[PDB]
């Protein structure tokens, strides 16, 4: 059931292979070439012959990889701008000769795809998506699960330098003039700007580096609007395209009245995958979906985290409403480090969170889940991003996970015969069955959980 997308842009041509058409497909393979098909289209109306030759040879390799991988589906998409070149129809025929069926996306289709890519990764998004590619900048309004409007501007990476050279304010003038024709910007002020595309992913990675962001995670990385113009000077003083991307981001975000610059790990390709799902599947939480799959493939006994979540959550009914799903995700990942040596499991599980591909998740939630999972695997607390109350909360989550996983041996259906409750500075483990699971190691884990609640522990048989 593996599937592929070939994304033919004005600059980058990319093959991505995914494990299946699911709510959050895993990436099996990724390869790109900077073929620069669109570079000379504005000047001559023609694609360079050298770009055509490179594109065809690399696309032939991508087609061949799809054959040996026995992909069940392969979708090849291109832009209307390249089709519309004087030799664009010829190029598309040459691509057909490879064996590839090329779907040409209009500006509308392409903007819809990038917008739904962001909605796939950030389901409650409400703002403007900017997909900066080689030939164009797509701006897309997203709100309440839907793409609301969009527009395409000729401000791709390959385009910015000619404008900036004209004068100091030429890029600002260009955006000012263009935005007068876009009637929906007025209803989209003071919202996040969701950054999509390779150029702005590189820029966000540069920003994390120069700010010594402790562990840099791309998805949901947030920059203040006043930040891009400063990166222009950072690049200038390090010891071109990056500078152009920062200049465009500064001007665009200011004229949009954007209040935050939010990186999305997902873009046009994930939007195409999302739109291929039926309506009900699109509404599934992608963090929970992917964390569930991870425990299915990684666990000793497949995914046992749902019953674990229901059991431990009798301690956490008063958690902030938005945190239930984070506690849930941690429970779904609670068996995913079992193959590491015991003394490394806490480090290993943290790296699965901090160095994995997860969406539906921001930095604070990543820290909550990682802290809880590390504690669940730690047999030996403060946290810079987390509040003290949430640090304590995550330690309690982790100790409850640890107790439940130890009590059940990981076969969490057995937890249905017990309850774990907090009241009046007492932590009470009640058995209504499976009484034989009581033991000294369970009592030690129970005492540790109680310590995290500043509580005294009791065991009750019912
Ligand atoms: Cl493009
Ligand atoms: Cl591109
Ligand atoms: Cl990309
Ligand atoms: Cl990421
Ligand atoms: Cl313990
Ligand atoms: Mg693109």
TrEMBL record:
Record-linked InterPro entries: ATPase_NBD, GppA/Ppx_hydrolase, Ppx_C, Ppx_GppA_N
Pfam families tied to this protein: Ppx-GppA, Ppx_C
Keywords for the protein's UniProt record, in alphabetical order: Metal-binding
Occurrences of domain Ppx/GppA phosphatase N-terminal (ranges): 16-279
GO molecular function terms listed in the Swiss-Prot or TrEMBL record: metal ion binding; pyrophosphatase activity
Key word Metal-binding present: yes
Binding site for Mg(2+): 110, 136, 138
CDD domains assigned to the protein according to its UniProt record, in alphabetical order: ASKHA_NBD_HpPPX-GppA-like
Record domain Exopolyphosphatase C-terminal: where: 324-413
UniProt name for this protein: Ppx/GppA phosphatase
């Amino acid at each position: 059931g593996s599937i592929g997308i070939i994304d033919i842009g004005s600059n980058s041509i990319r093959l991505v292979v995914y494990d299946q058409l699911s709510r959050a497909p895993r990436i099996l393979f990724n390869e790109k070439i900077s073929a620069q098909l669109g570079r000379n289209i504005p000047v001559d109306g023609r694609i360079d012959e050298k770009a055509i030759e490179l594109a065809i040879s690399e696309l032939t390799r991508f087609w061949k990889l799809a054959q040996i991988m026995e992909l069940s589906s392969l979708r090849t998409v291109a832009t209307a701008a390249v089709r519309d070149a004087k030799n664009g129809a010829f190029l598309l025929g040459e691509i057909a000769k490879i064996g590839l069926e090329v779907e040409v996306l209009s500006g509308e289709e392409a903007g819809y795809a990038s917008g739904y890519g962001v909605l796939s990764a950030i389901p409650d998004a409400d703002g403007i998506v900017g997909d900066l590619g080689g030939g164009s900048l797509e701006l897309i309004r997203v709100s309440k699960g839907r793409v609301k409007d969009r527009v395409s501007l000729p401000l791709g990476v390959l385009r910015i330098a000619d404008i900036r050279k004209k004068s100091r304010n030429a890029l600002d003038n260009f955006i000012s003039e263009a935005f007068k024709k876009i009637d929906w910007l007025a209803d989209a002020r003071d919202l996040p700007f969701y950054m999509v595309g390779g150029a702005w992913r590189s820029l966000a990675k540069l920003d994390m580096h120069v700010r010594h962001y402790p562990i840099p995670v791309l998805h949901n990385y947030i920059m203040s609007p006043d930040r891009p113009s400063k990166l222009i000077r950072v690049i200038q003083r390090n010891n071109e395209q990056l500078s152009d991307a920062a200049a465009l981001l500064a001007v665009v975000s200011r004229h949009l009245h954007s209040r935050a610059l939010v990186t999305s790990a997902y873009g046009l390709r994930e939007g195409l995958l999302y739109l291929s799902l039926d309506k009900a599947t699109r509404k599934l939480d992608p963090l929970l979906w992917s964390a569930n799959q991870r425990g299915e493939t990684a666990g000793r006994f497949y995914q046992q985290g749902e019953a674990l979540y229901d059991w431990m959550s009798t301690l956490f009914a008063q958690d902030p409403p938005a945190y239930h799903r984070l506690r849930h995700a941690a429970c779904l990942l609670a068996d995913s480090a079992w193959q590491a040596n015991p003394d490394f499991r806490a480090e290993q599980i943290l790296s699965i969170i901090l160095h994995g591909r997860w969406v539906g998740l921001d930095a604070y939630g990543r820290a909550l889940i990682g802290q809880a999972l590390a504690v669940s695997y730690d047999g030996a607390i403060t946290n810079n991003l987390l509040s003290e109350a949430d640090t304590i909360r995550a330690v309690r989550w982790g100790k409850a996970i640890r107790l439940g996983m130890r009590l059940s041996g990981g076969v969490t259906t057995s937890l249905k015969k017990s309850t774990i409750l907090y009241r009046n500075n007492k932590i009470i483990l009640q058995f209504s069955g499976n009484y034989k699971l009581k033991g000294e190691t369970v009592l030690r884990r129970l005492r540790s959980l109680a310590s995290s609640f500043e509580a005294s522990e009791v065991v009750e048989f019912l």
